[PDB]
Amino acid sequence: MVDIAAVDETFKRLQSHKGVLGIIVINAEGIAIRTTFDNDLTVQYAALVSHFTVKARSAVRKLDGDNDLKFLRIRSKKHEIMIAPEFERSHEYYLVVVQDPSREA
Amino acid sequence: SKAVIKNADMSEEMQADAVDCATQALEKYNIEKDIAAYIKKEFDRKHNPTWHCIVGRNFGSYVTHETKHFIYFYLGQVAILLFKSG
Amino acid sequence: MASGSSKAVIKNADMSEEMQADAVDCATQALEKYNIEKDIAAYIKKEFDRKHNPTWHCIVGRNFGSYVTHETKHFIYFYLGQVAILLFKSG
Amino acid sequence: VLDPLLSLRGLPDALELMDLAINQNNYLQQLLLYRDIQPVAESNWPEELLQELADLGDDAPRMEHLWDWSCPLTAGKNVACMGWNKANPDLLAVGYGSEPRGLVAFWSLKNLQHPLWWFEVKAAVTALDFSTYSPNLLALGMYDGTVAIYDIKSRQGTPSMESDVHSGKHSDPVWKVKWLDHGPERDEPLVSISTDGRVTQWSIAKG
Amino acid sequence: EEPIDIFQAIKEGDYEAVQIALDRGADIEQTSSGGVTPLIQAVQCGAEQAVEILVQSGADVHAATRSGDTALHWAAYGGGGALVQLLLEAGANVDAVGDLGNRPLHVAASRGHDQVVGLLLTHNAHTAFKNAYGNTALSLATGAKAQAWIKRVAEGGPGERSKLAAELAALEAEADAKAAER
Amino acid sequence: AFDFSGRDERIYVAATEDGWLHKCSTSYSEQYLESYRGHMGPVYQVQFSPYKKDMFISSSGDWTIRMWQEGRDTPLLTFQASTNEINDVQWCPTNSTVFGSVTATGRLEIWDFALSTVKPVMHQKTPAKLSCMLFAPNYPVVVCGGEDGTVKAYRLYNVSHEYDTLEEQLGRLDAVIKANVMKKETGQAGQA
Amino acid sequence: MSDIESTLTRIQGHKGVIGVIIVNNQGVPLRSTFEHDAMTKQYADLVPGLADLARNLVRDLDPQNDLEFLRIRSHKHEIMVAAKDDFVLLVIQDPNAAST
Amino acid sequence: RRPRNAPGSVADFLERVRDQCEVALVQNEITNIFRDDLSSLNDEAD
C-alpha cells in the first residue's frame, strides 16, 4: 500500500486544529522528512528541536533510567511548539507541531 | 549525532580523539563557549599546545593551522573547529 | 540598506586603541565588499597579516563560542550590528 | 525575616499558571468526553410516558454531571446568584449570600477549588449583572437595598461607587438588576427591582 | 490477454489502459488493501482524465475508504480545483462525513486550499459544522483570506455564495486571459 | 423580577409577590400596560422567551411554572410536577421547547414541553436546596447553585437544536402551543 | 503571603502532584515539597538547564520571543516548568492521575 | 513511502502521537481564552 495516503491524512488532521502554524517530521539526525514550512525555517526548527530533545532525553534518563520521554511542548508568548518523540531501536523520530495558541477561530 | 568531518588536516587516531572529546564536551556542557573551552584545554593536555577551538552553528573563519593540526566537523548540526597555532 | 553606521559594539579588546580602530575599519570594509563570512574573515586575516606581523586568525559569525590562547595585545571581539567578529594572533 | 518568595514578583502568577496546569491535566478527560474526542405528581407521572422515554433509548434527552465549582471559603454560603460575563462566556461571577456577609467569587474552568478572584461585601448579595459594553463592570443589588458597581480590572473589594439613601438606596432587598443594551453610542444604565415596590433606573454618568 | 491493472494504469497515467480495463470488465468499485476505489486512486494521483473516465464509466463519486475519506476529500487534499469541480458536478457530497466527522470544506480549510474552499462554499458547503475535535472550518483555515471567505459565507449564506461564485469565475477568467497572453 | 421585551426596550413584564404580572412601560410611569393573574404565590422569576417575544415563562413559589402570552391575563399553560417551590426557571437557548427549573427541595428539572407539558424530560435531585441556575451561552451545560455554596454543571443530551434555525424553532413552538392550549376563544367567533 | 500559601497548599492538595520546587536564579531551591533533598537537588540542577536551553531555542527562533511555560511528558512522570527572570518553578506530577 | 509496519514507519509514529498532539492543541484554546480573560479586558479599558 501507499504510506503517503496515511501520512497525508495524519498531517491534514493535525494541521486542521486552531492556529496550527505547521508540521514537521524529523529523523534521528536532526533532518526533516516532511515539512509544511519553508526550507530555512524548517532546518532551524529541525536542528533546535533535535538538540533540545536529545538533551531532554539525557536528563530524563539520568533522573530515572526506567523512565523515557514521551512528549514535549514549549509555549512561548506568541507560539507553542509540540514535540512528539519516538525512540525505537530501528528509528528515532520527532513530530513538531507549531501552533499559535492565542489565535481566534 | 555522527561526526561530519568537513575539513581535516589530521591523522585518523587523533581525529577519533577529537570526535570523542567533542562528544564528551557536548554531553557535559550546553554552551558553545564552554564546549570550546573544554576541547581546547583537553587538547592542550593531550596534544602539545597551543590549540584553538570554535564551537557554534553560525560562523565563517579563515585561520592558518599547523600541518596535521586542523579539523572542522559537524556533530549533528553544531560546527566544531580545531586548529593548532602558536 | 540601513545606511546608518552600525556602532562598533566592542566586547573584548586586548590590543592598542589605534590599531583596534584600524581593525574596526578593516571589518567595516570587509563587510562592505563581501557578504559571506568566510570571505570577510579571509580578507580581514589577509590584511592583518600584511600590516600587523602575521599570523592572525579571524572568525566572524552570529552564534558560536570559542576559547583560544592569543598573543598579548593581539586580541579583540566586537560587533558591527548583530554580527560578532573575533580576531586573535597566534603563531 | 523576609521570605525569598516576596522577592519573586511573578511568583503568584506562576502559581496560578501551575494551578491551571494541574486542573487542566485533571479535567482533560472530562472535557475530552464532553466534546467527544476518542484518544406525589412524580408517582402520578404516566407509566406509558415513562415507557416512551425508555423506548427512546439513547435518543432520550439525558444528563451527565461534569464538574463542580466548590471552595472551602464558599462552603456554608447560600449561592445567591450567578452570571456569565457578557464578553467572557466561560467566566461566572457568583454571589454567595443568604445581615449575613456576602462573597463574590469569579469562577472558571481553570479552577474548580478556588475562584480566580474573590472579594467581600458588607452583606448578602442578591443580584449581579455584567455590563454588555464594559464586561469589567459588575452591577450588584445587595440585600440591604444598595446598588453598587464593581470594576474587576482594579481587582479591589471596594465598589467603584455606591447608592445610598441620599442617592436612592432601596429600603428592602434588591433582587434583580440588569444593564440596558440601548446601543453603544449612549450610556448603559441599570435597572433594579426591590421588594419595597420600586423599580429604579440608574444613570452611571451622574453617579 | 492478462487483466490490465486499473490501479497501475491510473498510477502511470495510462488512461487508455483504464478505459480498456473498464470495457473488458474490470471492477470500477474494486477496493485495494486500503479500500481505495479506482476513482479515489485517480484523484490521489491527480489523473484528471482517468477521473472523468471512471465517472462516465460508473465510478461511485461518494465512495470512501475504510476511514471514511472520500474521493472529494482526497481531491481537497490534492488542492486541484479541476479535480474538485469534476467531483462536484459528478455528485460528490459537498459536506461528506470523512474520518472523525471531517467534511470536505473542513479539510480544504485545514490545508488552506483557497480554490477548493471557494468551490465548496459556492457548492453550498456549510461552515457551521463541527469536527470531532471541536473546530470549525474557520478554525481550520490556515490562510487569512480563506478565513475571511469562510466567515462571510457564515453570515451571508446562498447570496454570498453566488457572489463568491461570480468572483471565482472572474479570477478564473483573469488566469485564462493571462495564460492566453503568455 | 422583571424582563424587558425585545420588541421595545421601553416595555417589559414585572412579577409581584401577590401572584401578579404587569406589562409596564418605562415611558408611562403611572399604570401598567397589561395585567396577568393566576398565580397564588410569589412569582419568583419572569422572562420573555428569546424565540418569541410576545410569549413568556414564569416560575413562582406556589409550586408552579406558568406560560403566559400578551393580551391574555390568564396563563397559557401551567406546569407542576411536584409539590415543591420552583425557585427559578431559565429558557434553553438551544431549543424553543425546553426550559430548566430549580425547586426549593433541591431538584434540577429540564422540561421539554414539545414532548410533555406535565413533567420534566430530565430530573436530578440533590441533598441541598437549589437557589439559582443558568445555561451556558455557548454550551449545552446547565449550572445550578444553592445553600451548599457549590456550583454544579451538567451536560444535556438530545435537548439542543443548535444547528436548527430560528424559523423552524418558532414553527415548532407555535405547533406545540396550538396542540396543547385549550380552544377557549374559538366558541365566540361563530356567533357574529 | 496568605494568597501564596493558600495557592501552595492547594497545589499540594491537587490530585497527582508529586513534588513542587521553587528555585532561585542561582540554582538553589528556595522551597521544596520533596521529603528528600537529594531528588530536589537533582531536579534543581538538571531541569533549569533544560529551561535555559528552551529559552535559548525560543530566542534563536525569534529574539523578541522568550520562553513562557515548558511541559516535559515522560512515561511515568511529567515535569512542569515556569521560568521567570528571578526564579524557576519546577514540579513533578503524575499526568495519568486524572484517569485514577 | 516506506510501507506500513515496515521499520521506520512514519505513519505508525504519526498514528501513535496523533491523539496526544491533538489533545495538546485542544488544551491551547482553553489556555488562550482564559488568558484573554484579563488580556482582552484591557482593550475595553482603553
> Does the residue C56 lie in any domain?
yes
Report the candidate in D60, E119, D153 with the shortest Cα–Cα distance to residue F159: D60
> Does the residue C3 lie in any domain?
no
| Experimental technique used to determine this entry | cryo-EM
Domain coverage including residue B43 = 3-84
What DSSP assignment string belongs to C2-60?
--SPPPEEEEEEES-HHHHHHHHHHHHHHHHH--SHHHHHHHHHHHHHHHS-S-EEEEE
What DSSP assignment string belongs to D99-122?
---EEEEEEBTTBSSS-SEEEEES
Orientation angle between helical segments A3-16 and H10-39, nearest 10 degrees: 10
Can you name the residues that pair with C88 across neighbouring β-strands?
Answer: C57, C75
Q: What residues have CB less than 8 Å from A78, skipping those under 6 apart?
A: A100, A101, A102, G62, G65
In chain A, domain spans = 2-104
Can you name the residues that pair with F99 across neighbouring β-strands?
Answer: F91, F111
What DSSP assignment string belongs to G37-78?
HHHHHHHHHHHHHHHHHHHHHHHHH-TT--EEEEEEEESS-E
H31/H36 Cα distance (integer angstroms): 9
C40/C32 Cα distance (integer angstroms): 9
H33/G41 Cα distance (integer angstroms): 36
Smallest CA–CA distance, residue D28 to chain E, in Å, is 13
Could you give the angle at the alpha carbon of D24 between the alpha carbons of D19 and D26, nearest 5°?
A: 100
Name all chains with 3 or more CB-CB pairs below 8 Å to chain F: D
D192/E128 Cα distance (integer angstroms): 38
E113/E10 Cα distance (integer angstroms): 24
3-class DSSP assignment, residue G91:
strand
Spatial strand order of the sheet with G17-24 comes to: A32-35, A20-26, A92-99, A80-87, A69-76, G67-74, G78-83, G87-93, G17-24, G29-32
Residue owning grid cell 511541559: G71
Residues G46-57: b if buried by 16+ CB within 10 A, e if exposed: bbbebbebbbbb
Task: Let me know if chains E and C touch, i.e. at least 3 Cβ pairs under 8 angstroms.
Answer: no
Question: Searching chain H, which residue's CA lies closest to the CA of residue E139?
Answer: H29
- The three three-digit cell numbers of residue G69, written as one number: 511555560
Cβ within 8 Å, pair A71-G71? yes
Name all chains with 3 or more CB-CB pairs below 8 Å to chain G: A, B, D
D135/H37 Cα distance (integer angstroms): 10
Q: Cβ(A53)–Cβ(A94) under 8 Å?
A: yes
Q: What is the DSSP letter of E70?
A: B
Q: Which of residues 69-98 of A touch H (CB under 8 A)?
A: 70-71, 73, 75, 80, 82, 84, 86, 90-91, 93, 95, 97
Orientation angle between helical segments E81-90 and E114-122, nearest 10 degrees: 20
H32/A100 Cα distance (integer angstroms): 10
Smallest CA–CA distance, residue A25 to chain E, in Å, is 17
Amino acid (1-letter code) at residue C29:
Q
Could you give the angle at the alpha carbon of D59 between the alpha carbons of D55 and D60, nearest 5°?
A: 65
Q: Residue A62: how many CB atoms within 10 A of its CB?
A: 10
Q: Is the preceding omega at residue C55 within 30 degrees of 0, hence cis?
A: yes
- The three three-digit cell numbers of residue C30, written as one number: 570587509
Q: G interface mutation test: which of D3, D7, D9, D15 has the most G CBs within 10 A?
A: D15
- The three three-digit cell numbers of residue F62, written as one number: 406556589
3-class DSSP assignment, residue D145:
coil
Q: Residue A49: how many CB atoms within 10 A of its CB?
A: 24
Q: Resolution in A, one decimal? A: 3.1
Q: Cβ(G44)–Cβ(G21) under 8 Å?
A: yes
Report the candidate in G23, G50, G49 with the shortest Cα–Cα distance to residue G34: G23
> Does the residue C2 lie in any domain?
no
Q: Cβ(F110)–Cβ(F100) under 8 Å?
A: yes
D129/D149 Cα distance (integer angstroms): 10
Q: Residue A82: how many CB atoms within 10 A of its CB?
A: 27
Report the candidate in D46, E71, C20, E74 with the shortest Cα–Cα distance to residue A5: E74
Q: Cβ(E142)–Cβ(E112) under 8 Å?
A: yes
Structurally, how many domains does chain B consist of? 1
Phi and psi (nearest 5°) for H22? -70, -30
Phi and psi (nearest 5°) for B53? -130, 140
Q: B interface mutation test: which of A26, A29, A53 has the most B CBs within 10 A?
A: A29
Question: Searching chain A, which residue's CA lies closest to the CA of residue B1?
Answer: A29
Task: Let me know if chains D and G touch, i.e. at least 3 Cβ pairs under 8 angstroms.
Answer: yes
Q: What residues have CB less than 8 Å from G39, skipping those under 6 apart?
A: G19
Can you name the residues that pair with F68 across neighbouring β-strands?
Answer: F56
Q: Is the preceding omega at residue F150 within 30 degrees of 0, hence cis?
A: no
- Comparing CB atoms, the residue among A7, A11, A99 nearest residue H28 is A99
CA distance from start to end of chain B: 31
Write out chain E residues lying below 8 Å of A105, CB-based. Answer: 135-136, 138-139
Write out chain D residues lying below 8 Å of E133, CB-based. Answer: 35, 37
Burial class (CB in 10 A: 0-12, 13-18, 19+), H36: middle
CA distance from start to end of chain D: 46
Alpha-carbon torsion angle D116, G5, G11, H30, nearest 10? 20
H34/D92 Cα distance (integer angstroms): 12
Cβ within 8 Å, pair G85-D14? no
D137/D135 Cα distance (integer angstroms): 5
